[PDB]
From Swiss-Prot, chain A:
<dbReference type="GO" id="GO:0012505">
    <property type="term" value="C:endomembrane system"/>
</dbReference>
<feature type="binding site">
    <location>
        <position position="147"/>
    </location>
    <ligand>
        <name>GTP</name>
    </ligand>
</feature>
<feature type="binding site">
    <location>
        <position position="35"/>
    </location>
    <ligand>
        <name>GTP</name>
    </ligand>
</feature>
<dbReference type="GO" id="GO:0048709">
    <property type="term" value="P:oligodendrocyte differentiation"/>
</dbReference>
<feature type="binding site">
    <location>
        <position position="147"/>
    </location>
    <ligand>
        <name>GDP</name>
    </ligand>
</feature>
<dbReference type="GO" id="GO:2000074">
    <property type="term" value="P:regulation of type B pancreatic cell development"/>
</dbReference>
<comment type="function">
    <text>Small GTPase that acts as an allosteric activator of the canonical mTORC1 complex, an evolutionarily conserved central nutrient sensor that stimulates anabolic reactions and macromolecule biosynthesis to promote cellular biomass generation and growth.</text>
</comment>
From Swiss-Prot, chain C:
<feature type="repeat" description="HEAT 19">
    <location>
        <begin position="667"/>
        <end position="709"/>
    </location>
</feature>
<comment type="subunit">
    <text>Part of the mechanistic target of rapamycin complex 1 (mTORC1) which contains MTOR, MLST8 and RPTOR. The mTORC1 complex is a 1 Md obligate dimer of two stoichiometric heterotetramers with overall dimensions of 290 A x 210 A x 135 A. It has a rhomboid shape and a central cavity, the dimeric interfaces are formed by interlocking interactions between the two MTOR and the two RPTOR subunits.</text>
</comment>
<feature type="repeat" description="HEAT 11">
    <location>
        <begin position="371"/>
        <end position="413"/>
    </location>
</feature>
<feature type="repeat" description="HEAT 12">
    <location>
        <begin position="414"/>
        <end position="448"/>
    </location>
</feature>
<feature type="repeat" description="HEAT 13">
    <location>
        <begin position="449"/>
        <end position="473"/>
    </location>
</feature>
<feature type="repeat" description="HEAT 18">
    <location>
        <begin position="625"/>
        <end position="664"/>
    </location>
</feature>
<feature type="repeat" description="HEAT 15">
    <location>
        <begin position="495"/>
        <end position="534"/>
    </location>
</feature>
Swiss-Prot record, chain D:
<feature type="modified residue" description="Phosphothreonine">
    <location>
        <position position="190"/>
    </location>
</feature>
<feature type="modified residue" description="Phosphoserine">
    <location>
        <position position="250"/>
    </location>
</feature>
<comment type="function">
    <text>Serine/threonine protein kinase which is a central regulator of cellular metabolism, growth and survival in response to hormones, growth factors, nutrients, energy and stress signals. MTOR directly or indirectly regulates the phosphorylation of at least 800 proteins. Functions as part of 2 structurally and functionally distinct signaling complexes mTORC1 and mTORC2 (mTOR complex 1 and 2).</text>
</comment>
<feature type="repeat" description="HEAT 28">
    <location>
        <begin position="173"/>
        <end position="216"/>
    </location>
</feature>
<comment type="subunit">
    <text>Part of the mechanistic target of rapamycin complex 1 (mTORC1) which contains MTOR, MLST8 and RPTOR. The mTORC1 complex is a 1 Md obligate dimer of two stoichiometric heterotetramers with overall dimensions of 290 A x 210 A x 135 A. It has a rhomboid shape and a central cavity, the dimeric interfaces are formed by interlocking interactions between the two MTOR and the two RPTOR subunits.</text>
</comment>
<feature type="repeat" description="HEAT 26">
    <location>
        <begin position="97"/>
        <end position="133"/>
    </location>
</feature>
<feature type="repeat" description="HEAT 29">
    <location>
        <begin position="217"/>
        <end position="242"/>
    </location>
</feature>
């Protein structure tokens, strides 16, 4: 068996809470208005091996919100989320990632960028290429998701567990 | 000490006796400091609460190097306190000790005038 | 600020050097800088400083070079525990350390584990959760099926967390035991030894809280069960596994259990370790019950695996059997396991690798069975005589053997004196060794009849070694240092010692080797103690020749403590001065020498010099009093006019030592001194460091000590000042000094 | 940060807590550290956004500090401008009174920062779009700075746009009747320089003409001549020609925190108390307590102070059987 933790970070009012809740239960609503700190548990099977994730929904940080330290010690996995329907959220995810790498030290850590709300094809303002390029600058994995395409959401979490799993060894 | 000072006075008395015992150490060490330590003893005692038991503890601590006749005022005030508390026997025996003689045994003779203040207290 | 960054760059460059000494010195310099020079700045600026230091930690850890990463690890180790463990510190340091643990170098892994342990002791609020991850991560690696390096690293980090941060590890104890034993059975020697060490640490953790647990812990029984499972014949049939490894693990586990149940045996082993080298020990009640329940099973297992010829198995058996003896001498004496125990010990004594610890075990066994061992003395003695050089003949002997003799004397001593008398001159034929001196010291402390011969033989040895001449009724630096140290320390009698000092007064105080000078000074100062006591105390036993020798030695010692530039020699020489010396230090020339020494560049030498002269002031006020006045004048001058806080605190420190050691001079100058100190306290701006105010407060208290009756007038102003300082919560201001001052003031 | 979260929770009811929270806050932003001060200014802006109507009695005091603290620094400038945006959203009815005190800072920002604060000036320009009723009076002072801003090539073209759509937006609410004819010539002058500017300049000119139609007819020939020289048309030209919910308690973690089965020593029990209080704050249903959790973790006495309230929330949130457990 194994245990892991994951912290989801990004601008407020983006896929963080919705994506987490879709993963853990499998339902999306407009409740759970702007959160403060939420914790959820889920067992997962990756590469034919068990993982126990304690997912953490974080309060959305703005461009000037100081980086909380509860997430800079024990998380060993970071989901960087930005809504594809807000360029400001995409700048904010840059700056929060920057503050994280500032505070977590140099250490190459499993980071993954997730552009959620891809189902809003009629309102997107960030392209797949933009996020892919930004992640490649970070050298982190990239994905798109929606709070109703639950399968992809599962993959998202799987990917981070894969992301640490491949990269923990080397 | 977390709740109130009134209950913490039962430990303030301990602090008092420890510090005064260090003062006994100093009194033994330095003859010239003896008078000033005696005066400090009197002052701090006057600054203490008027409790017979705690007074007895402090005075026993002070008695290690000082006989009663060297601090007649302190034992006179102690006897006065014992009289106030109703412990007439303790005050009477302390007065006899300070006098050196017991007028109860000498009812047919006047009081020993040699220590008039102690006679007044008796 | 640019100066700070440049100094950081110098530290980074120095720590990048592969030289271990250079890295250590750079780390210590950074430690000093952060401890003193960083505290002069605010806390947000301190956070920025930690950010810069973490950039320099990057710079040290940027390369994959083992030396560079070791230097970075030393950096992180140095920073932690010095200042408050701010959040950024703990976060960045933990993240950096997690990158290092699976390293291939065992040295880097050990350093990283110790760093993780001290980071846990950092005490920041996140600590309680931090370790809960690392332990877990470590435990996960124990569950891993491969990657010996990962298992090793997990084992060491678990050990360090258990040892250094017990409270937060005690909760994780329950999952710990599940995986620790699968870590123990790993074929790798190092992983097994480290894992049983972690088991040690956690078992002491369990013991520390077991008495208050109203319900017995199952951990000891579970560990015994895994031990026997290691000894299982059927379970040993698991292929892809060497039976010797499982037996070694089982023995190690039983050693753990015995030690935590046989704390007396650990005390004996600790005594031996202290003797050879030149902590708290607890015992578990429930483990004691378990061991006495199944002790014979342990003995049967140990004797069954005795026949194994693996060197490490033999080592463990020799390290374990004396533990059983200390645990239960009676079983060995009665059931006759003692016969095979002695036979095996003497049989493995003839192979070096296990012989070394076999001698330790022989001493332990001799103590444990303090009576029956007599029967085996004829054997042991001869073989130890064989270990020691015979009279005819590199003749370098292992230290451990000597230790055994000492311990062998602690139980059979009075019975074996008649052969110790023969065994003296062989060790004297071995040559100098710190173990030799220690064992001779212990034998002296045991039986005086042996003490006399020990003293005489050691005098002859020192006559041959240091003096190059026989006793009457190039040379290695370390050997001479040891010789002089033992000469000074251990007790002796006779006229010959006088000669020793005189030669050492002329040939070794001026020796070109620094350590030799320092040790010669210290030893001569020690050696003149009984002669000076006889001269001063026993005025009727005074020998003018001894007085002349004392004066000559002191004069040359002071010349050495004034001439040579290096600081340590002067510091040790001056500290060697004692009240015994004072009667002969008051002369004009010696007093002038001390006067000159007081004006030396180093600071602590000035402190000790002012203390010494103040102490001397009693007997000959004529020479010292005007010079004390002059030093007071200059101290006041610098305190008033020196713009560097360092100079001000130095001045205050000299004044404090002056008043402590020279009160009578200070009574007439009571007023101006206190006026100056009050003005110092009333200065609106503080110096760069708070040491100035601390020295001021200590000086105030030391002044009050003698001057209280007069100072009664001035008490109120300095009292309100002290009240203001205390009521300022943000000022540490060496608060013990402030309260010390307040107490002394009120008392005086 | 916790205070901001609580206000977000109590947006309707937070007014009652103004007199205690607000005053001393000002003091700290007066004496705290630079970066901390900028974060505090941003959080004060959020407070304004949640206190919108009721910060008037404190409004004056606030502007004093920012009048003192609007140094020509890029980061401080951006934060203060955002705070201006949130004020003008809040005090919309009354902000006219405090507008002139802040006018000179904005003038100096336009005039001096020929540096990447020009980008910051764009943010300032965004704020300008919201002062409508308040700025109806001081438009005469404020506009000509904007005029030189979008008429000067030296300023970066995005700044020129920002200014030009800023005047376009201000066309919708203010009075341009009398003077604004003159500022057409800058706009017309801008039409001679860059196509990207020319498009949105045509848009802004159309908006202004709509406002100025009657007045614009009198002096159209010069501008329409220049326009037809540039060969663009618009329809208006011809037209003129003719609160928070209760967070759900995770009973599992609540019981786990209370599980002191293996706490023995004094250190163990104190640690258990610490972890208990922190878990109670984390798992509390009341959003304000869970907000306080972070400071509690960074500050143990904070955890101790609200142990009772957090436990009360959790206990009220439990089932009878779970209550008995
Ligand atoms: O003669 P003392 O033992 O010193 O006591 C008495 C009196 O106490 P009595 O009720 O026992 O006579 C007063 O009360 P205490 O202080 O002794 O409790 C005392 O003090 P006060 O006048 O302040 O009450 C007063 O005078 P002094 O303070 O100098 O001791 C003193 O003499 P009197 O008998 O004349 O009152
Ligand atoms: N259509 C659509 N709405 C979404 C999607 N993701 C989130 N939302 C909606 O947007 C709003 C905000 O998104 P949400 O996921 O709740 O933000 P958040 O991360 O919880 O916000 P905070 O709690 O972190 S401050 C919610 O009302 C939610 O219903 C999505 O993929 N598609
Ligand atoms: Mg949320």
């Amino acid at each position: 068996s194994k245990s892991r933790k994951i912290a989801i970070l990004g601008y407020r009012s983006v896929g963080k809470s919705s994506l987490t809740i879709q993963f853990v239960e499998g339902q999306f609503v407009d409740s759970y208005d702007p959160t403060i700190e939420n914790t959820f548990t889920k067992l997962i099977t990756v590469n034919g091996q068990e993982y126990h994730l304690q997912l953490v929904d974080t309060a959305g940080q703005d461009e000037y919100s100081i980086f909380p330290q509860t997430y800079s010690i024990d998380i060993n996995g970071y989901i960087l989320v930005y809504s594809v329907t807000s360029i400001k959220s995409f700048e904010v995810i840059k700056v929060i990632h920057g503050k994280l790498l500032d505070m977590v030290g140099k250490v190459q850590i499993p980071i993954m960028l997730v552009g959620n709300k891809k189902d809003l094809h009629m309102e997107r303002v960030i392209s797949y290429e933009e996020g892919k390029a930004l992640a490649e600058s970070w050298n982190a994995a990239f994905l798109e998701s929606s709070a109703k395409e639950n399968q992809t959401a599962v993959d998202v979490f799987r990917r981070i567990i894969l992301e640490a799993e491949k990269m923990d060894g080397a | 000490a977390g709740e109130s000072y009134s209950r913490a006075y039962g430990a303030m008395v301990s602090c008092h006796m420890l510090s005064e015992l260090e003062e006994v150490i100093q009194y033994k060490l330095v003859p010239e400091r003896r008078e000033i330590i005696r005066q400090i003893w009197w002052e701090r005692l006057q600054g203490c609460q008027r409790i017979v038991e705690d007074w007895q503890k402090i005075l026993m601590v002070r008695s290690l190097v000082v006989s009663p006749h060297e601090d007649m005022r302190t034992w006179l005030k102690y006897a006065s306190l014992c009289g106030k508390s109703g412990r007439l026997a303790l005050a009477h025996k302390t007065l006899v000790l300070l006098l050196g003689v017991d007028p109860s045994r000498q009812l047919d003779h006047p009081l020993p005038t040699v220590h008039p203040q102690v006679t007044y207290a008796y | 600020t640019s100066s700070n960054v440049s100094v950081l760059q110098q530290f980074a460059s120095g720590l990048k050097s592969r030289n271990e000494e250079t890295r250590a010195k750079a780390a210590k310099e950074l430690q000093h800088y952060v401890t003193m020079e960083l505290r002069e700045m605010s806390q947000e600026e301190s956070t920025r400083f930690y950010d810069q230091l973490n950039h320099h930690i990057f710079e040290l850890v940027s390369s994959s070079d083992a030396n560079e990463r070791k230097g970075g690890i030393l950096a992180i180790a140095s920073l932690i525990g010095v200042e408050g463990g701010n959040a950024t510190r703990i976060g960045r340091f933990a993240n950096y350390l997690r990158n290092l643990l699976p390293s291939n170098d065992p040295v880097v892994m050990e350093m990283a584990s110790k760093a993780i342990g001290r980071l846990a002791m950092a005490g920041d609020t996140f600590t309680a959760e931090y370790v809960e991850f690392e332990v877990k991560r470590a435990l996960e690696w124990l569950g891993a099926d491969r990657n010996e390096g990962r298992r090793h690293a997990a084992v060491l980090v678990l050990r360090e967390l258990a040892i250094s941060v017990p409270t937060f590890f005690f909760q994780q104890v329950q999952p710990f035991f599940d995986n620790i034993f699968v870590a123990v059975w790993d074929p790798k020697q190092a992983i097994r030894e480290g894992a049983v060490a972690a088991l040690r640490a956690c078992l002491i953790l369990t013991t520390q809280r077991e008495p208050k647990e109203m319900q017995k812990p199952q951990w000891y029984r579970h560990t015994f069960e895994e031990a026997e499972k290691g000894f299982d014949e059927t379970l040993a049939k698991e292929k892809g596994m060497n039976r010797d490894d499982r037996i070694h693990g089982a023995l190690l586990i039983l050693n753990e259990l015995v030690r935590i149940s046989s704390m007396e045996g650990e005390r004996l082993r600790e005594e031996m370790e202290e003797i050879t080298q030149q902590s708290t020990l607890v015992e578990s009640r429930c483990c004691r019950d378990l061991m006495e329940e199944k002790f014979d099973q342990v003995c049967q297992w140990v004797l069954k695996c005795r026949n194994s010829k693996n060197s490490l198995i033999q080592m463990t058996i020799l390290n374990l059997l004396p533990r059983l003896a200390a645990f239960r001498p009676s079983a060995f004496t009665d059931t006759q396991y003692l016969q095979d125990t002695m036979n095996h010990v003497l049989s493995c004594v003839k192979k070096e690798k296990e012989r070394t610890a076999a001698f330790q075990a022989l001493g332990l066994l001799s103590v444990a069975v303090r009576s029956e061992f007599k029967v085996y003395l004829p054997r042991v003695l001869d073989i130890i005589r064989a270990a020691l050089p015979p009279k005819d003949f590199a003749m370098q002997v292992d230290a451990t053997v000597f230790t055994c003799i000492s311990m062998l004397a602690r139980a059979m001593g009075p019975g074996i004196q008649q052969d110790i008398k023969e065994l003296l001159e062989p060790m004297l034929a071995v040559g100098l060794s710190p173990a030799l001196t220690a064992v001779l010291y212990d034998l002296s402390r045991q039986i005086p009849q042996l003490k006399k011969d020990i003293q005489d033989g050691l005098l002859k040895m020192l006559s041959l070694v240091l003096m190059h001449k026989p006793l009457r009724h190039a040379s290695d630096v370390g050997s001479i240092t040891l010789a002089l140290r033992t000469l000074g320390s251990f007790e002796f009698e006779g006229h010959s010692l006088t000669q020793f000092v005189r030669h050492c007064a002329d040939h070794f105080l001026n020796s070109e080797h620094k350590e030799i000078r320092m040790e010669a000074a210290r030893t001569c100062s020690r050696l003149l103690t009984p002669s000076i006591h006889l001269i001063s105390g026993h005025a009727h036993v005074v020998s003018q020749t001894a007085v002349q020798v004392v004066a000559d030695v002191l004069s040359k010692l002071l010349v050495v403590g004034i001439t040579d530039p290096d600081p340590d020699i002067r510091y040790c020489v001056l500290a060697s001065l004692d009240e015994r010396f004072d009667a002969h230090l008051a002369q004009a020339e010696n007093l002038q020498a001390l006067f000159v020494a007081l004006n030396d560049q180093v600071f602590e030498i000035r402190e000790l010099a002012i203390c010494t002269v103040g102490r001397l002031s009693s007997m000959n006020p004529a020479f010292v009093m005007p010079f004390l006045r002059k030093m007071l004048i200059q101290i006041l001058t610098e305190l008033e006019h020196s713009g560097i806080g360092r100079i001000k605190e130095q001045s205050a420190r000299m004044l404090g030592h002056l008043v402590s050691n020279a009160p009578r001079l200070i009574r007439p100058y009571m007023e101006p001194i206190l006026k100056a100190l009050i003005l110092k306290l009333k200065d609106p701006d503080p110096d760069p460091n708070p040491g100035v105010i601390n020295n001021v407060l200590a000086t105030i208290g030391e002044l009050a000590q003698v001057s209280g009756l007069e100072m009664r007038k001035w008490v109120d102003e300095l009292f309100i000042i002290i009240m203001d300082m205390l009521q300022d919560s943000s000022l540490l201001a060496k608060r013990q000094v402030a309260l010390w001052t307040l107490g002394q003031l009120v008392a005086s | 940060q916790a205070i901001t979260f609580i206000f977000k929770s109590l947006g309707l009811k937070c007014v009652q807590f103004l007199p205690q929270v607000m005053p001393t806050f000002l003091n700290v932003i007066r004496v705290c550290d630079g970066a901390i001060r900028e974060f505090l200014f941003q959080q004060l802006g959020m407070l304004v956004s949640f206190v919108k109507s009721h910060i008037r009695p404190y409004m004056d005091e606030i502007v004093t500090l920012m009048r003192e603290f609007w140094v020509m620094n890029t980061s401080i400038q951006s934060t203060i401008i955002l705070l201006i945006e949130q004020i003008v959203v809040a005090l919309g009815g009354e902000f006219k009174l405090y507008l002139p005190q802040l006018i000179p800072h904005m003038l100096r920002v336009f005039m001096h920062d020929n540096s990447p604060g020009r980008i910051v000036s764009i943010k300032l320009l965004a704020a300008i779009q919201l002062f409508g009723a308040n700025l109806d009076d001081y438009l005469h002072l404020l506009l000509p700075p904007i005029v030189k801003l979008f008429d000067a090539p030296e300023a970066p073209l995005p700044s020129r746009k920002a200014a030009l759509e800023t005047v376009d937006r201000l066309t919708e609410s203010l009075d341009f009747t009398d003077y604004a004819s003159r500022i057409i010539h800058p706009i017309v002058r801008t039409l001679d320089q860059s196509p990207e500017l020319r498009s949105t300049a045509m848009d802004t000119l159309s908006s202004l003409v709509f406002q100025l139609g009657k007045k614009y007819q009198i002096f159209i020939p010069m501008v329409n001549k220049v326009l037809v020289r540039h060969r663009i048309n618009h329809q208006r030209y011809d037209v003129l020609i003719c609160p928070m919910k209760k967070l759900h308690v995770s009973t599992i973690n609540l019981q786990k925190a209370w599980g002191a089965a293996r706490r023995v020593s004094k250190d163990d029990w104190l640690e258990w108390l610490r972890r208990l209080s922190l878990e109670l704050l984390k798992d509390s249903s009341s959003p304000s307590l869970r907000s306080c959790w972070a400071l509690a973790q960074a500050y143990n006495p904070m955890a101790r102070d609200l142990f009772n309230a957090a436990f009360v929330s959790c206990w009220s949130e439990l089932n009878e059987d779970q209550q008995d457990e």
